[PDB]
Symmetry: C2
Subunit: 441 residues, 2 copies
């Protein structure tokens, strides 16, 4: 489960990759004028084999530079460098390796090239990829988030804005509502669950702009990336255009393409959030991404009634906390994870009937969710509803609950060798129904 | 899911591996006296990068040789070669590449030490691994079964025998029964289900040997490989000693080590059967292996009564067919897979009583098993039994059943985005209990 970034450099040579089994602790380059070749080593002593360095010319050859990464206190987090001509072929000319502690390089030549850098954070480099033949034509990285982190790119745009925004979702981005004329005036977003984020921007009464929507069909499509431009608009530096890149198509552009353009060459990603600043307009924006082994999880249930609005929550890392409100039945549920991803509250919408707060703690990852059990049936307040009435959560070490009160119809899952990676169901005033997402382990 | 074989060669340099994403279609070696270096190229054009050849010497470059594999009509299945001293280092001295149609090589010096060969069959080489520094210290391969096949190794031993054996299991080897004194007189095996395999050998009326047992605890251990010796015993060429290699320990030797030794350096393998020849003694023995899954498997259930004997069945490739004999309930169920793996029959141990035969076909892989549901209740013949009363099987395309007759209590599994890879439960005269093994998709 990792995100591909890049590669940067020429289009020649053949694709290679090296996904380290253990942390990357060494990089070996041969340099003269350009980068002749690269190889790697992980913490276990495994090596990647050498990419590039293939002539037959012996001179050229290049001086050996070894770069040490002091795992675990130091880890590789990113790279920079430059590309440009060699013998007529577009290749890597210089490289720098960026850790949580310092930067190594640049190695190679700093002049006469197109340089690249990556506006990334909260990442660890767990491998490389690129192109090679006689030379290293191109180089990229594979990244995973730091423990308890979420990879982010950007933001791009200008420095101002009065309202900062920052969110991550536990399902997927389903809708994007943009207002735009020459600039992006505002953006807002909806969850798979129908939860709305923002109106970030559009505070200028004279200048709200013109509404356009992106509607993502989650059965066929997922948001993978963004691109756009930023520049002047009425004296300010703001986002002037955006496009939304999925696995199917590119939506937009929205706004008009002016100033500096930006993009992120990423694959294997799902966008799970956005951060930036807005005021009158959209000053700056960047994304949060999670790796997609989006080909992946088993779903069980839900159990319970058919009322309520459907919801789902999949952890970014590990489910840490459950907040259950209960009385005679389960009014609401909510989840938190070790990376700080907190679900909306599912249920508990009628303030006359919200029950009592219960918190469940899970010492993740040595303790982790494993199953649920409970009952469902009729519950009356003003109307009659069919809901979850009692609920328990089991881990590898413990069973928490039951919360609520037992009604006749019980439910349970005689299941083993699994972990629970998220939940789903229906909720309105109460928790109508609940089930689980599981993976082996 | 692949098995590692070898590597052969010295302990110098560093470990490396290459697992191709598509079929290996090219191999590049540099040869002078030893193999200076190696790299690979798969059908999409992706390269591995170069292992070895870090020598700063010149008449140390070696001549480049390319080997093409004419995929998909030709595929790599094995290798052979030799290793020995070069400048005081134990390295790969020569190599050959073995295909379904032909052999390429030898490349390098044959005159030189130790040769190696692999008595393998039904394999596809999907990768290599080895050790490399200045030179190519060592090489091995990763393998998978051909479609519908099972990787085999051996047999080792002498060429005669009046009887022959050849079986595979759908659980694992729990027991091994050996009669031995100076040679191996006979061998037998038990399933995890207690089903017995043969007694092969022990036909000398004057010389049957002393019994010894190996018990494998299927919770902390699994059979991985075997080794042993073969040579003369009273004018027969037979297996003289065997040991049984698990992920933890090595059980044996049984018999006495005399004549020629054999071993097969594999990792990632689960032994799933045996083949060979036997008569008075054990003439020859070989193994079947399956990759121990880097993917794990979720268990659900079982549902039903507590009576009976535990059994499990896990498909080698994918479930193809099911046989049930239920009338007023369920005497037995059985299963077949697309690789020829046939399960035992799980109860219908009463001559009297076996209901009517029912064959269910699944178009694996385009059609595949989804879940189950049934009933349990009380069934009476001579006495009273809590068994599974009726039963149904869902796939991604259809349901099959029920069989027999629905009772009071009806269990089901509200599961999605999964495939069933096997079953487990309890059986006697009837199917007391049944549950499933699932994975995502």
């Amino acid at each position: 489960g990792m995100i591909s970034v890049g590669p940067w450099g020429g289009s020649g040579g053949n694709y290679w990759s090296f996904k380290a089994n253990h942390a990357i602790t060494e990089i070996v380059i041969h340099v003269k004028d350009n980068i002749k070749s690269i190889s790697f080593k992980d913490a276990s002593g495994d090596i990647s084999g050498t990419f590039g360095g293939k002539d037959p010319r012996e001179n050229e050859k290049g001086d050996e530079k070894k770069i040490k990464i002091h795992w675990p206190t130091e880890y590789l987090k990113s790279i920079s460098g430059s590309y440009g001509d060699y013998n007529g072929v577009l290749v890597i000319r210089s490289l720098s390796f960026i850790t949580n502690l310092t930067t190594y390089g640049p190695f190679g030549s700093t002049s006469g090239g197109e340089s690249f850098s990556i506006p990334i954070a909260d990442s660890v480099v767990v491998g490389f990829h690129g192109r090679a033949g006689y030379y290293l034509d191109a180089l990229g990285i594979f990244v995973q988030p730091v423990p308890h982190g979420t990879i982010s790119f950007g933001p791009w745009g200008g420095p101002a804005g009065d309202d900062a925004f920052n969110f991550k979702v536990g399902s997927w981005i389903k809708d994007i509502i943009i207002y735009a004329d020459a600039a992006i005036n505002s953006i807002a977003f909806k969850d798979a669950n129908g939860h709305c984020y923002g109106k970030f921007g559009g505070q200028d009464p004279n200048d709200i702009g013109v509404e356009k929507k992106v509607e993502i069909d989650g059965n066929l499509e997922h948001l993978k990336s963004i691109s756009g431009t930023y520049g002047n608009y009425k004296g300010f530096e703001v986002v002037t255009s955006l496009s939304f890149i999925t696995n199917v198509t590119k939506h937009g552009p929205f706004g008009i393409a002016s100033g500096t353009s930006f993009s992120i060459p990423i694959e294997g990603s799902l966008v799970t959030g956005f951060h930036g600043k807005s005021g009158y307009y959209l000053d700056s924006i960047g994304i949060y991404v999670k790796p997609r082994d989006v080909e992946g999880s088993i779903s069980i249930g839900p159990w319970g009634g058919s009322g309520g609005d459907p919801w789902s929550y999949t952890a970014n890392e590990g489910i840490n906390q459950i907040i259950i409100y209960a009385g005679s039945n389960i009014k609401s549920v909510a989840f938190k994870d070790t990376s700080g991803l907190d679900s909306a509250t599912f249920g508990g919408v009628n303030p006359k009937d919200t029950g009592e707060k219960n918190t469940v703690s899970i010492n993740w990852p040595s303790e982790y969710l494993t199953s649920i059990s409970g009952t469902y049936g009729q519950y009356k307040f003003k109307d009659v509803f069919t809901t979850i009435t009692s609920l328990s959560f089991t881990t590898n070490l413990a069973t928490y609950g039951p919360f609520g009160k037992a009604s006749a119809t019980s439910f349970s899952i005689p299941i083993h060798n699994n972990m629970v990676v998220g939940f789903h169901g229906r909720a309105g005033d109460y928790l109508d129904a609940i089930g689980i997402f599981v993976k082996p382990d």
